[PDB]
Amino acid sequence: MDPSQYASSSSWTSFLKSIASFNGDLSSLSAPPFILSPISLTEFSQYWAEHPELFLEPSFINDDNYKEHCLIDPEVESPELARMLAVTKWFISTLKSQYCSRNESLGSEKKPLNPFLGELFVGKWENKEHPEFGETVLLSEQVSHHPPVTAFSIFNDKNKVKLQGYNQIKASFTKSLMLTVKQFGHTMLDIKDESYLVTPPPLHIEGILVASPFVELEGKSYIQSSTGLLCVIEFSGKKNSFKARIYKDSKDSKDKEKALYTISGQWSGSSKIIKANKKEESRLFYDAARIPAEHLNVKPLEEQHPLESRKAWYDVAGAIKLGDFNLIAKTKTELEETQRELRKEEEAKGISWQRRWFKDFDYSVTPEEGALVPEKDDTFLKLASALNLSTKNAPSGTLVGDKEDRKEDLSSIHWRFQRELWDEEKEIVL
Amino acid sequence: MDPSQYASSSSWTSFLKSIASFNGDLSSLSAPPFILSPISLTEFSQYWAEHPELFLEPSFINDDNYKEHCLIDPEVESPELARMLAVTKWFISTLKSQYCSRNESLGSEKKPLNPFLGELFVGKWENKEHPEFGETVLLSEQVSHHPPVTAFSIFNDKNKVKLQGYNQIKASFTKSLMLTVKQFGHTMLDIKDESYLVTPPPLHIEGILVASPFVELEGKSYIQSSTGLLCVIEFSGRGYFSGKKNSFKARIYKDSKDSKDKEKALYTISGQWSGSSKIIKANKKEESRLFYDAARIPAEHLNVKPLEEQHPLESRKAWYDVAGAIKLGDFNLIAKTKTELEETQRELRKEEEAKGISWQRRWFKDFDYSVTPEEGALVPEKDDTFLKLASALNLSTKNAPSGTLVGDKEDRKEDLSSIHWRFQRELWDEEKEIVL
Ligand SMILES: CCC(=O)OC[C@H](C)CC[C@H]1O[C@H]2C[C@H]3[C@@H]4CC=C5C[C@@H](O)CC[C@]5(C)[C@H]4CC[C@]3(C)[C@H]2[C@@H]1C
Ligand SMILES: CCC(=O)OC[C@H](C)CC[C@H]1O[C@H]2C[C@H]3[C@@H]4CC=C5C[C@@H](O)CC[C@]5(C)[C@H]4CC[C@]3(C)[C@H]2[C@@H]1C
């Protein structure tokens, strides 16, 4: 059918009734095939680096050139500040990929494939037109299914830029049938020996009544650096508007008048930056329209391992593409069988397929005997302390003392990339 | 460099100066590598059919089903009117492909590759997901280089949908460096035995001074059917500053005489052709329905054969080295690979001729529509479609800018010719070399 017919269709009306008093597992609620995406959530990790030049730019800024690497302020006060500005630009550049990509490719936000445990998604940005960049690798892994958790790393060995992070959500419907989404997890970016902790924002899905879903961001994201500098990004919705403020240190963040820079605009369009309070002098900071996302290289389907997302989901995606409710169910049953047998083969080969490239670490003050614990000078702990960030499994961005942090009965388990596990990988390639 | 550095760069400042000193045409001003596109103008013909379902929809509308194939008006008065609304939707859907594709893929409008004479670009939309569609074929050919003229046909044998057209431009800069572009040519769409004449609009390239070029449509396009029905599409850049762009108003009339009076519009369509538009029937203006939302159906790109299987006349293969040099931004390699292309094509033409292969007028021929045709010219056939539909529209049959009406100032230019390029299907059926 034409999308102009979706909202008043029998299928949509039925769907709306099924969410009107929804209970249970949103991933397992039947939906009309028109609102199904063929893309799994393990693929979403790619959205952290679809502007390779922005991802790598902070690594090119040093004590001898920093004033030449701050386009909005050639009189920037320090290379640390120059690198904070570049990291903030990179972070803002990720949002359109994160939150708009399905609108562009599918026509609206849709219901993603719910990844199987052990599912992998890998590829590389070869950066062939910029040999100083070198190749950047993505590894994404579904480390939990109950509930869905995706862990990921994106790393450029040539420039010593590495990212790792994980993501999970908790979602429910409002009375108005907006889907309220809380993100959980965090991402760390290391630029040589300097680190950044990034927290994703809460969001909600609008447009469900009219069968044209889309994301609207809310709340705040943080970017806390090992240099002390802190970026606070506040999302409002005029559509997709934010404001981001950079502070000398985290304590200054209670007072906006102490912001070194203030960025405002739309994360899906243009934003401007003002230094100090010089409101009459703003410059263009980032314009998402001007810089096309660059998609990573993923190997041909013929060459993929059966754990790899697109190969694994291929028949299901075909059954979605042509709309057959029963073929969708049949192919899903077949994936469950395929994976059951594949797991047995992995275990026979001594492969920790559930914890393939990531392990889960227990940051509780007092961890359980047996648990993996953080190393002495753990980066997350140092940055979370600087930000006054909860180190518990609270929603992303929760501060110490907040309602979700005060809970006794809340774990502090976080997924961490283990590079040696990838270096020893014997099945998956790029 | 970052795009924010383009406008103040030495390169751009030099480039803007070359514009006043500009004399020649576009493919003279050498322009900096950052404002070059690696895509030839022969590929632009594909923009007429990147929504295959909308291209073919009118063929599915008949006397027994028309009220079920008119989403915005299940009480539509006739199947002819149903088909006119469908063709209008199709035409509107083309515009985002035609005018926004490079903004999307390159970050701005950029200078396309100027096609060589004889250059070809072919492909097909296989429509694998919908077997009742059948394959739709694109043939695009550069029929002139002095000046650049691209001719094209897009055809679906299964459903008897065929399109043919040609395009060329005249461009001029204003003192402020707006590029005024007049389109010339027209496009015919045949839906079984029913025909439609489509005229493209004039435009400006804005944003040159700040090195972020973009197209802004202006003026009017027409869609004149053999059924008498007429759509007039008026384009507007109103609301720039507020972030509005790409707006239009389209009105469908019983015939061209009625079109002299906006109150006689059967329907009125208004909105953004790169976004959403609504339709009102009659003047029931207190109620509208969604007509088209370009955001909801992504363009579908045609299938092109792998580079290593292309003939050396085919655009992507032909321009491959130049395209790679542009992606690298390498000025000297761009000029060197261009010089190589001219050598390659010069030799290729000699080979084509040695084998008796017409390469200059391969699938299209030029027909003289003047009352007194040049001796030896090809002339139109008895009940020519263009002549009939131009007569219904009161459109000039001369080489005036697209959409010029009989008696307009441009219709009166002295000495003006009336030569129009036409597809010759038999020439493709008998093609000696190229395949899909
Ligand atoms: C049965 C489906 C249903 O309940 O309603 C379907 C609604 C029509 C759609 C709800 C889904 O919308 C998807 C949007 C997804 C988020 C988009 C981007 C990100 C960023 C990435 O870095 C982490 C994942 C995250 C937060 C996605 C999570 C899954 C979301 C909310 C999908 C909704 C289930
Ligand atoms: C030398 C470069 C120069 O002079 O100015 C550079 C400006 C920054 C860019 C000028 C170019 O902009 C391009 C836009 C092109 C039109 C876009 C779409 C269509 C639709 C299609 O169906 C027929 C062709 C047409 C009219 C294109 C014609 C060529 C245009 C105007 C390009 C300009 C050279």
Swiss-Prot record, chain A:
This is Oxysterol-binding protein homolog 4. Residues 18-362 are annotated as: OSBP-related domain (ORD). GO terms for molecular function: lipid binding; oxysterol binding; phosphatidic acid binding; phosphatidylinositol-4,5-bisphosphate binding; phosphatidylinositol-4-phosphate binding; sterol transfer activity. It comes from the Eukaryota. 25-hydroxycholesterol binds at residue 98. 7beta-hydroxycholesterol binds at residues 98, 102. The lineage of its organism: Eukaryota, Fungi, Dikarya, Ascomycota, Saccharomycotina. The keyword RNA-binding does not apply. One of its GO terms (cellular component) is cytosol. Pfam families: Oxysterol_BP (PF01237). Changing residue 170 to A: Strong reduction in cholesterol transport. Present with 32200 molecules/cell in log phase SD medium. SUPFAM superfamilies: Oxysterol-binding protein-like (SSF144000). Keywords: Cytoplasm, Golgi apparatus, Lipid transport, Lipid-binding, Membrane, Phosphoprotein, Transport.
